């Protein structure tokens, strides 16, 4: 499972179909042709938010990291939640897909393509005054049998989605060259 | 008239009320000629069946029998928690008569 | 050229749209009520 | 014809509207002889059933009775919020006539 | 045979096409005697029904009627946008003849 | 019995495989008399229908025509891509005879 | 009654158990005359079918065959892993006669 601090409450998340990328109102919303790009996402920064722009929602591999990250971005916020999400192919390990071009390598994040459906969310810890209420509130709509078997998307499926611009050196070298889209590198 | 699986189940002979408070574990379904049935099992280690339709079953119970297999099929898929099962203990495996789910 | 950023946005979107169908196959199926085809015909 | 559950509820003798505005709390289904039925319960305290198809039902009502048991199983399994129920209060538990849901 | 709902609707008398482009707001299902039917409403304020299986229907329609009520329930439950509706305008609420949805 | 749709399709006169490999785009269902059918269109411009149960239909196909209509409805709501269609090209729009989906 | 698929299968001459522990890879449905059937394949090459309403079948199986097909469509659409398949090994492709699922 993965974790992410967010100022958005459990009923706002249910109202949108899940944890949505910036601009995306809800999950199955086709009305906003949102720009999806892993590289552009990995380099961005939104105040009051852990990277959620460019068609991707970042998540951490641990609770202390999810919390560390929540304490920088959401410090003082009388209330925020730490969402426990299950692994599924719509997740991409940033460092692995971007290699030495991963903007914030020491960070280690597993970004999710298009957002995180509500059915993929395990539960959430409430965080008051910057202190974690240790009792996880579970999500009854979590599809355990479906998300129990799935795993993060392996790097060989994201290289083509790495999103580097055309002139980028990466596209001309390993391992990106083998999966470069038309017009790139 | 009855208002609970307990009240309804105490109106028959050879019936027991089992409390599971667990989701189904396994689901078996047979089109096998003469064994058209559904078998379910839980972790407690109990196996229950929906019996095959036959001439003893009034046309009314016929439709009720097909409904139960539908419920058990989608209850399994949804991983829905079963509360209690009224069953006829005079056949092995116990024959499902009623079922309740809660919350 | 833009083909890159247009190809990127496109392989991404088709990756999205197909995953959004796995999810729909999970959740919308709860609502599927079977029919006794022999009953109505 | 009527255009809402309340206007419809008003064309029958011995009926009353129950504003639920909540999801079903418990679901009980029985394939037991002569008692092939469905009972549902709510947080509020009430209990309703869907009668056994006997003869206080015309031929098209049999099909309608089955559909309602289909809808109630779906609504429960999915925690769909029911809005109002129209029931015949001259039965115990009260008997279901119509149902409405709002999004 | 036709290829669009609009062509379908016009081989009929007293029919009319309504553009909805919206999800069903309310759903009412009634098993009340001689009022077995589904009523649906949109936030625009329109109200349509799937009529009672009477004699104004040739036999083949009876299986199509039941199909239409399944569609409307799953559409309402899933929140699928309904595009157009082809209705019979000689009665109130308007009767649904055909429905179409696009993705 | 044939092992693939292509094979099963090759056993009929006036049929032909169509590789769609995309999700349905429009769904139109009609309960209008003598037009109880389902029409589906794709974004390539193609249009297929499930024909009204009629004269050139044996009695085993009847339960099978309904099955197709239910399959098309849920394949459309969920965005499941259809792989290959095996249609009879001597009706207009092309009439659906078999379907296959993969993954 | 047998309390397991392995057990149930075990009494029909010409049966064979198959441990699949995978989901259905392709689903083919035909309403074509005399091929009104379903065929499912697994990544691991194996193909199976649900035969056409053969004359050698009894009427309670008539209902059970249609049920099986319902089960295969929803199992396939939901990506639910199948445990084993009891099948008749004297038809081609091997004919399903029972199925199980777990966890």
Instruction: Please give the span between the terminal C-alpha atoms of chain F, in angstroms, as a whole number.
Output: 23
Nearest CA to CA, how far is G76 from chain F (Å)? 8
Q: Which helix (H) or strand (E) holds A132?
A: strand A131-132
- Asked if residue B35 lies in contact with residue G8, where contact means CB atoms within 8 angstroms, the answer is yes
Query: Taking the CA of residue A150 as centre, how many other CA atoms within 13 Å lie in the half-sphere pointing to its CB?
Result: 22
- Residue G14, classed as helix, strand or coil, is coil
Residues in chain D: 103
- Asked if residue A81 lies in contact with residue A9, where contact means CB atoms within 8 angstroms, the answer is yes
Query: Taking the CA of residue E48 as centre, how many other CA atoms within 13 Å lie in the half-sphere pointing to its CB?
Result: 27
What would the two tokens of residue E95 be?
């009767």
CB contact under 8 A, C30 and B74: yes
Structurally, how many domains does chain G consist of?
Answer: 1
G97 to each of B50, G8, G69, G85, how far by Cα in Å? 17, 10, 11, 8
**DSSP state, residue B13:** S
Catalytic residue among A109, A134, A141, A174: A109
Smallest Cα–Cα separation from F69: which of C37, G10, B55?
A: C37
Give the angle subtended at the CA of A148 by the CAs of A142 and A149, to the nearest 5°.
Answer: 140
Buried b (16+ CB within 10 A) or exposed e, A145-172: bbbeebebbebeebbbbbbbbbebebbe
Catalytic residue flag (residue A107): no
- Asked if residue A34 lies in contact with residue A21, where contact means CB atoms within 8 angstroms, the answer is yes
- Asked if residue G61 lies in contact with residue G53, where contact means CB atoms within 8 angstroms, the answer is no
Distance CA E48, CA E35 (A): 14
Task: Indicate the burial class of A135 (C-beta count within 10 angstroms; 0-12, 13-18, 19 or more).
Answer: exposed
CB contact under 8 A, D78 and C31: yes
Q: Is A77 left (phi over 0), alpha (psi -120 to 50) or beta?
A: beta
Q: Is the pair D, B in contact (3+ CB pairs within 8 Å)?
A: yes
Residues in chain A: 185
Residues in chain C: 41
Torsion of CA A30, A32, A36, A42, to 10 degrees: -130
Way it was determined? X-ray
Distance CA B98, CA D29 (A): 6
Among the partner-chain residues C20, C37, C41, the one whose CB lies closest to the CB of F79 is: C20
CB contact under 8 A, F80 and C20: no
Distance CA G100, CA G4 (A): 9
**Is the dihedral angle over the CA atoms E38, E51, F30, G27 positive or is it negative?**
positive
DSSP track, F5-57: HHHHHHTSTTEEEEEEEEE--EEEEE-STT--EEEEE-TTS-EEEEPPS-TT-
Instruction: Tell whether G57 is within 8 A of chain C (Cβ).
Output: no
DSSP track, A71-105: HHHTTT-SEEEEEEE---TTEEEHHHHHGGG-SST
What would the two tokens of residue G73 be?
């469509």
Query: Taking the CA of residue E62 as centre, how many other CA atoms within 13 Å lie in the half-sphere pointing to its CB?
Result: 14
What would the two tokens of residue E74 be?
């799953």
CB contact under 8 A, F98 and G30: yes
Tokens 């929906």 sit on residue: B50
Q: What are residue B86's DSSP bridge partners? A: B17, B98
CB contact under 8 A, C6 and A183: yes
Distance CA B36, CA B53 (A): 8
Q: What are phi and psi of A100, to 5 degrees?
A: -70, 5
- Asked if residue E24 lies in contact with residue E42, where contact means CB atoms within 8 angstroms, the answer is yes
Domain residue extents for chain C: 1-41
Q: Point out the annotated binding site of A for NAD(+).
A: 4-18
B73 to each of A149, G20, G68, G70, how far by Cα in Å? 21, 19, 11, 10
- Asked if residue A116 lies in contact with residue A18, where contact means CB atoms within 8 angstroms, the answer is yes
Among the partner-chain residues G62, G63, G78, the one whose CB lies closest to the CB of C26 is: G78
- Asked if residue B83 lies in contact with residue D29, where contact means CB atoms within 8 angstroms, the answer is no
DSSP track, B30-61: E-STT--EEEEE-SS--EEEEPPP-TTS-HHH
What would the two tokens of residue A32 be?
């906003």
Q: What's the resolution in A? A: 2.5
- Asked if residue C18 lies in contact with residue F40, where contact means CB atoms within 8 angstroms, the answer is no
Write the CB contacts of A169 (distance below 8 Å, at least 6 apart in sequence).
Answer: none
Q: What are residue G29's DSSP bridge partners? A: F99, G38
Pairing mode, strands B94-102 and B47-50? parallel
Chosen CATH of C1-41 out of 1.20.5.240, 1.20.272.10, 1.10.10.10, 3.40.605.10:
1.20.5.240
Domains detected in chain A? 1-185 (3.90.210.10)
Distance CA B35, CA F4 (A): 29
Write the CB contacts of A85 (distance below 8 Å, at least 6 apart in sequence).
Answer: A1, A2, A3, A4, A19, A59, A112, A116, A120, A121, A122
Residues 1-60 of G with CB under 8 A from B: 1-5, 8-9, 12, 50, 57-58, 60
What would the two tokens of residue A9 be?
């409450």
- Residue C6, classed as helix, strand or coil, is helix
Chains with ≥3 CB–CB distances under 8 Å to E: C, D, F
Nearest CA to CA, how far is A68 from chain C (Å)? 30
Distance CA G56, CA G65 (A): 13
- Asked if residue B78 lies in contact with residue B71, where contact means CB atoms within 8 angstroms, the answer is no
- Chain E positions touching F91 (Cβ under 8 A) are 1
Distance CA A110, CA A153 (A): 10
- Chain E positions touching D80 (Cβ under 8 A) are 77
Write the CB contacts of F59 (distance below 8 Å, at least 6 apart in sequence).
Answer: none
Distance of CA B1 to the CA centre of its chain: 21
* Residue of chain G with shortest Cα separation from A149: G81
- Asked if residue D82 lies in contact with residue D72, where contact means CB atoms within 8 angstroms, the answer is no
Q: Point out the annotated binding site of A.
A: 4-18
- Residue ranges in chain A assigned as alpha helix (H): 10-16, 38-43, 63-73, 94-98, 144-149
Distance CA A116, CA A24 (A): 11
Write the CB contacts of B38 (distance below 8 Å, at least 6 apart in sequence).
Answer: B27, B28, B29, B30, B49, B50, B68, B69, B72, B73
Query: Taking the CA of residue F4 as centre, how many other CA atoms within 13 Å lie in the half-sphere pointing to its CB?
Result: 9
Nearest CA to CA, how far is B61 from chain C (Å)? 15
Write the CB contacts of F69 (distance below 8 Å, at least 6 apart in sequence).
Answer: E67, F29, F38, F50
- Name the residue range of residue D31's domain: 1-103
Q: What is the CATH number of the domain that holds B40?
A: 2.40.50.110
Instruction: Tell whether C38 is within 8 A of chain G (Cβ).
Output: yes
Instruction: Tell whether G66 is within 8 A of chain F (Cβ).
Output: yes
Smallest Cα–Cα separation from E67: which of C33, D103, F53?
A: C33
Smallest Cα–Cα separation from A119: which of G67, C20, E31, G65?
A: C20
- Asked if residue E8 lies in contact with residue E98, where contact means CB atoms within 8 angstroms, the answer is yes
Angle between helices E61-78 and D59-78 (to 10 degrees): 20
Distance CA G61, CA A104 (A): 63
A142 to each of A84, A90, A122, C19, how far by Cα in Å? 11, 16, 6, 16
Q: What are phi and psi of D99, to 5 degrees?
A: -155, 150
* Cis bond upstream, residue A175 (ω within 30): yes
Distance CA D22, CA E1 (A): 45
Smallest Cα–Cα separation from A82: which of A152, A145, A10?
A: A10
């Amino acid at each position: 499972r993965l974790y992410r601090a967010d100022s958005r409450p459990p009923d706002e998340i249910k109202r949108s179909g899940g944890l949505m990328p910036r601009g995306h109102n809800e999950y199955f919303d086709r009305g906003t042709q949102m720009n999806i790009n892993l590289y552009d996402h990995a380099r961005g920064t939104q105040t009051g938010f852990v990277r959620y722009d460019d068609g991707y929602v970042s998540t951490s591999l641990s609770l202390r990291s999810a919390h560390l990250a929540g304490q920088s971005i959401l410090s003082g916020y009388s209330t925020y939640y730490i969402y426990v999400i299950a692994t599924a192919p719509n997740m991409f390990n940033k460092n692995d897909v971007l290699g030495v071009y991963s903007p914030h390598p020491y960070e280690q994040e597993v970004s999710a393509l298009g957002g995180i459906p509500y059915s993929q969310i395990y539960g959430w810890y409430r965080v008051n005054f910057g202190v974690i209420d240790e009792r996880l509130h579970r999500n009854r709509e979590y599809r355990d049998r479906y998300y129990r078997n799935l795993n993060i998307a392996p790097a060989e499926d994201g290289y083509r989605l790495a999103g580097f611009p055309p002139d980028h050196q990466a596209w001309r070298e390993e391992p990106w060259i083998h999966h470069a889209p038309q017009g790139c590198g | 008239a009855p208002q609970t699986i307990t009240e309804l189940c105490s109106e028959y002979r050879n019936t027991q009320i089992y409390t599971i408070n667990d989701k189904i574990l396994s689901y078996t379904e047979s089109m096998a000629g003469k064994r058209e049935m559904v078998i379910i099992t839980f972790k407690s280690g109990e196996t229950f069946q929906v019996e095959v339709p036959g001439s003893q079953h009034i046309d009314s119970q016929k439709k009720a029998i097909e409904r139960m297999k539908d419920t058990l099929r989608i209850t399994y898929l949804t991983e829905t928690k079963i509360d209690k099962l009224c069953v006829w203990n005079n056949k092995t495996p116990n024959s499902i008569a009623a079922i309740s789910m809660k919350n | 050229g833009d083909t890159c950023n247009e190809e990127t946005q496109n392989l991404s979107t088709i990756y999205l749209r197909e995953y959004q169908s796995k999810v729909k196959r999970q959740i919308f199926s709860d609502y599927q009520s079977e029919v006794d085809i022999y009953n109505r015909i």
